[PDB]
Design a protein around this nucleic acid. Structure first.
Ligand SMILES: COc1c(N2C[C@@H]3CCCN[C@@H]3C2)c(F)cc2c(=O)c(C(=O)O)cn(C3CC3)c12
Ligand SMILES: COc1c(N2C[C@@H]3CCCN[C@@H]3C2)c(F)cc2c(=O)c(C(=O)O)cn(C3CC3)c12
Ligand SMILES: [Mg+2]
Ligand SMILES: [Mg+2]
Ligand SMILES: [Mg+2]
Ligand SMILES: [Mg+2]
Lengths: 689, 689
DNA sequence: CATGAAT
DNA sequence: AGTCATTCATG
DNA sequence: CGTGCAT
DNA sequence: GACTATGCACG
């Protein structure tokens, strides 16, 4: 796995720890083989502060590093009998690169302290533009090619920028204070989450060879990584309930006109467009997210319609993106409704070539309807799906009554509504969840006892808990029968066809079916505990939220959308109305206008003449001057006046929405009810206490 | 890997052999678990009538097919011990599916004869269309009163209802009518003898429940696969020298404006667009093809420029399409020159939503310049790269002298010009190759001797034979030292860097350096034999062609392109002249026309009046009537008469090309010389005899 | 045993 | 993101 | 131990 | 085209 140097020399030999096999290859190509060695770090280096000391020793990356370095580890470590003068960590210039640097540094600190204390650990700093490393260097170089990673850099460019000892700009790792360094590393990388959460809260603001400390290097790297994972990866926006990857998937597919009323496009075509325009990451990661939105046992209201093998409840792999074809679902269209009307904040992509929405208009409150999950850094998320009609009903009520209480809201939104059905138990815990954000509810399979011939009964499962694998469940129940942990099971039988779920647990003659069913509920996943952990992104910061701040954030959002949409349509109507006013007046003086253009020197002089001599505005003067010749035939002013009437009425009703809070909220309620009527579906999960 | 039936029954159990894992997964969901078992066949099945029996027994696909059939194989085959009553083969509707059916049928023939003789071996026929479903184009025509490209685009419920439901499926019963003729049919198609197969293809293939015989099924299936892979996969077109996948890559990237003058584009975005619009195959195959066109040690003139790790001469894996950026090279633009002018026959793609070029205009003879290779069915190709300037000079001569002899052409085209360089020996065999298509020439590494200290010498290799892996060569050379197959080798060192190839073979003190160098040339790969096998596609058929059928077919192609282009520009200039002629008349009667349009009631009326009153044509009247108002200012009649003159001359020069074979041929030469001057590059390979 | 578009 | 196996012609 | 976006 | 290991919070 390691590319070694030509000659052995522990006085000049350098070890390059490269992030990735591709970048490892590029390094291997652009290196100096006389003394430079390459070691690909395939994946993320294990946490040698969290993981056990056994599984740490059973790690491939760690072992081949301890072998390539050739000095041992822990207390059996002799820096004198090493193999390298310098060990350089070369990663991508992005956030995940900063995470690898963090993980690798904690390794070389916890188990190879003398190597770091002797200043033998370095950090290669690849350029960010093309050469510039900062924004100030770009400014000075302006008097560009943004490197998305090491993969986009050539071998000769790699050497000239970051590998040549005379040209490279390294960051030397030094231990200034062993006490403050021990504290920092142990907090950021410890098993305890709470000190890490607090550190992120207090520090991270969400708004040729230099030497850096350990505390500074661990702070700038884990600080850069934490902020990006919370804001721009794992956690959903509190409004549209989407992670950046899902929003980019829905938007790109919509921009490519890949909607529900059109033909399916090949998945790879969509995935490729997402990656080249908005989401600068792996094709597999994007596709796996695209597939999940097509699975109706993961989402209560699917956003993608996919043809072919997209998986099952048995958890078998979906067809590769070379096979499947996809398109947005009809209800996914409402998430993107009026996006063409400046109703949402847009920001530049990584490419700085095209703008992308930071949030979707969300004509329906997706965050509650579909849910989210949900593993960040310092924070985590688990929001269950809900009924489309019920959430809307609660939303409509809160629109009328902003200061509504949870007890009243639960008359409309009684609890979660899993797409997999099953039984939810714990009315008290549901309330606790809708208030504080956290809460532990019990999810139970829908069962039915069928009596067989011979005095023997049979348990028949028809629905299973959310996020539970059907195939793994059957195996676990069968293991109970095989091991005879409990007595009475004759045969476990998955009888689920393409049109129904059915797990049949046939029991022996004279066997307490109550004793068995109770055992399977406790020791298998027939019954599970579902933990609420409703955390989302409100105002760029992570926020644990109940049912109230969620609904309030959605209402506040839809208000902005409706207001912005109204300004947009009013802007269009005004501009035409202004043009129609001019055209009507033109007909009254058609002869003198044509005579004026006839006397004009050019297009610009013609418009300037229309302004001065006949008080037409710039916008009007443009429309008049660019009229096709045949429009001189028409002198019917009546039809244009009918358009004036229609436009003036539209501007009026639009302005009232912008000017009257009540009128606006009435509109919002009207649309939320239409969405309800169109996409209403009965409950699947029963509620008990 | 096998999904067994829930109930073992050698009377009703079916065994579906599915092409691919994903399709096997879809079948695993759409099956009836009571009696339908699934066995996914991953990749093409081994040719059991072509490979050594030792390799056959080691083939895991065969072993897992026998051990699940439960009846052994060969002479030790009890037909009553089988666990399945029916064995259905379910492949895609495409030609590769027909190949698998062929390979499988020969196995069940050779090693399981009683199984096929009992009529238990079936062939499942998937639907081809979906509007209900239809298997034939006639059935689609009747159903008219979704084109499936495989099984990966079908849902589980769809696959069941159409091909898996035993009461609603179309099956093919494989019956062996005669054991005599079926043997010759099997051996000719699958046997180790290539010549009889090539003859059978040239004799049968026209290049332009329900029972079925074995000889008929084998001929129909393999016939389709033979034809398809011959003219639509492995072999290049004789005109633009491109395989279908290479042509689709170039056209797609050019259509997406991913060219040399513009920014680089993420590779996955290009691959996805190709796969979804033109080339209905795997992403890796398309990307690998795209990567090769970027490697400057395989192509004499790269057609794709690529940023990042695109591999090396050591054979190390290039970066995945997630990492790399790419765009068309400048010279690749000349392959697509004038494609927007209907100079090339187009054809519908697989979606019938977009038309693709069947051949590129090719402003330079790409077949000889870049070469091709080169493994089809019944045929194979191997054309070496040539110098761009030399091939053009050869073609230019043949334009003036159609009946040019080979000995004369070689004064301009002396031989191949490998991008890897090295030495070519064998003037005689080159001529034999340029005449017949086949030839065996010798390629020798470029070496030099460097005197060292202590009286030692050092062999230095700077250039190596075409298509030779540098990493393996060094290993094989060093293996000579290790095994001491020749005396005097001290150390083998690859000293190549990012700007120079260098393999230093350091010798010992008193060692015969001439002896060492001679042994390596003969027993390693410092010297190899390049075998010409110039086979291309001429008139939809594979043709073993010499240097003359190639150059002539290119000139013939360039003729059609230039003729079709000249007609395009002429019709364009004609219609434009027609308008200019009318606009000049209008100026002299501007007021009368404006008054005439004002007097008119509408657009249609205005044109009829422009016709009747001033004899303007319909095309002329339309142009006048649709002029924007400001055009009444730009009333310069002279600059219109300049365009009029400029157009009449352009038509005159274009008509001369269409109406004179010589003037057209001079245009070929003029343009070919321009291409030559722009992309001229010195030889890299030296020639000897 | 490689080569290169396919599975 | 690398690894793993087969087709096909051919020396 | 599985979860779902990342390496 | 499936297989294999890491992060991160959490019962
Ligand atoms: C499972 O088939 C493949 C294999 N194998 C064949 C053997 C089967 C049993 C034991 N494992 C190996 C793995 C392989 F080595 C490579 C590829 C491959 O590169 C590829 C592609 O699209 O680029 C596609 N496929 C699938 C489309 C056939 C490959
Ligand atoms: C080599 O890393 C990966 C592994 N491995 C990690 C271990 C390292 C030593 C060898 N064995 C395993 C293989 C893996 F199991 C899965 C994926 C993976 O799914 C994936 C993706 O984009 O979808 C990307 N990568 C690469 C981007 C890191 C994966
Ligand atoms: Mg990266
Ligand atoms: Mg993955
Ligand atoms: Mg196929
Ligand atoms: Mg492959």
């Amino acid at each position: 796995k390691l590319t070694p140097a030509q000659s052995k020399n522990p006085a000049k030999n350098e070890l390059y720890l490269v992030e990735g096999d591709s970048a490892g290859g590029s390094a291997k190509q652009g290196r100096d083989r006389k003394f430079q060695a390459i070691l690909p770090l395939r994946g993320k280096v294990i946490n040698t502060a969290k993981a056990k000391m056994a599984d740490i020793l059973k790690n491939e990356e760690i072992n081949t590093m301890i072998y390539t370095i050739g000095a041992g580890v822990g207390a059996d470590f002799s820096i004198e009998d090493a193999n390298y003068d310098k060990i350089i960590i070369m990663t991508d210039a992005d956030t995940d690169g900063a995470h690898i640097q963090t993980l690798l540094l904690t390794f070389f600190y916890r188990y190879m302290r003398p190597l770091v204390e002797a200043g033998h650990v370095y950090i290669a700093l690849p350029p960010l533009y093309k050469y510039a490393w900062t924004d100030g260097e770009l400014e000075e170089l302006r008097k560009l090619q943004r490197y998305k990673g090491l993969g986009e850099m050539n071998a000769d460019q790699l050497w000239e920028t970051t590998m040549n000892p005379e040209t490279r700009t390294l960051i030397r790792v030094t231990i200034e204070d062993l006490a403050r360094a021990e504290r920092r590393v142990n907090v950021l990388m410890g098993d305890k989450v709470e000190p890490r959460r607090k550190w992120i809260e207090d520090n991270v603001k969400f708004t040729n060879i230099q030497n850096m400390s350990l505390e500074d290097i661990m702070g700038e790297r884990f600080g850069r990584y934490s902020k990006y994972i919370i804001q721009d990866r794992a956690l959903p926006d509190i409004r549209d309930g989407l992670k950046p990857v899902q929003r980019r998937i829905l938007y790109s597919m919509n921009k490519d006109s890949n909607t529900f009323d059109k033909s399916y496009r090949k998945s790879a075509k969509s995935v490729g467009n997402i990656m080249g325009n908005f989401h600068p990451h792996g094709d597999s990661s994007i596709y796996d997210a695209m597939v999940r939105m097509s699975q109706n046992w993961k989402n209560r209201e699917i956003l993608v319609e996919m043809h072919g093998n997209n998986g099952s409840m048995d958890g078998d792999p979906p067809a590769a993106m070379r096979y499947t074809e996809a398109r947005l679902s009809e209800i996914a269209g409402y998430l993107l409704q009026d996006i063409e009307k400046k109703t949402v904040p847009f920001a530049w992509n990584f490419d700085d070539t095209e703008k992308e929405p930071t949030v979707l208009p969300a004509a329906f409150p997706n965050l509650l309807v579909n849910g989210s999950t949900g593993i960040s850094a310092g924070y985590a998320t688990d929001i269950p799906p809900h009924n489309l009609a019920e959430v809307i009903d609660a939303a409509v009520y809160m629109i009328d009554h902003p200061t509504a209480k949870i007890d009243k809201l639960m008359e409309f939104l009684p609890g979660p509504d899993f797409p997999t059905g099953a039984i939810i138990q714990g009315r008290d815990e549901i309330k606790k969840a809708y208030e504080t954000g956290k809460g532990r509810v019990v999810v139970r399979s829908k069962t039915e006892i069928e009596k067989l011939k011979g005095g023997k009964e049979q348990i028949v499962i028809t629905e299973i808990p959310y996020e539970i694998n059907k195939a793994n469940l059957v195996k676990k129940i069968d293991d109970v029968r095989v091991n005879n942990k409990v007595a009475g099971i004759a045969e476990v039988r998955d009888e689920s066809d393409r049109d129904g779920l059915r797990i049949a647990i046939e029991l022996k003659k004279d066997a307490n079916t109550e004793l068995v069913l109770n055992y399977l509920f406790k020791y298998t996943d027939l019954q599970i505990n579902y933990n609420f952990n409703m955390v989302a992104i409100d105002n760029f910061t992570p926020r644990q939220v109940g049912i109230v701040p969620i609904l309030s954030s959605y209402i506040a959002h839809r208000r902005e959308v409706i207001l912005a949409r109204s300004r947009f349509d009013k802007e269009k109507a005004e501009k035409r109305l202004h043009i129609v006013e001019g055209l009507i007046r033109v007909i009254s003086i058609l002869d003198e206008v044509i005579a004026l253009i006839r006397a004009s020197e050019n297009k610009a002089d013609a418009k300037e003449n229309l302004k001065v001599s006949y008080d037409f505005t710039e916008e009007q003067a443009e429309a008049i001057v660019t009229l096709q010749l045949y429009r001189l035939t028409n002198t019917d002013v009546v039809v244009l006046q009918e358009e004036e009437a229609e436009l003036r009425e539209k501007i009026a009703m639009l302005a009232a929405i912008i000017g009257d809070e009540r009128t606006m909220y009435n509109l919002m309620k009207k649309e939320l009810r239409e969405v309800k009527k169109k996409f209403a579906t009965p409950r699947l999960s029963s509620l008990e206490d």
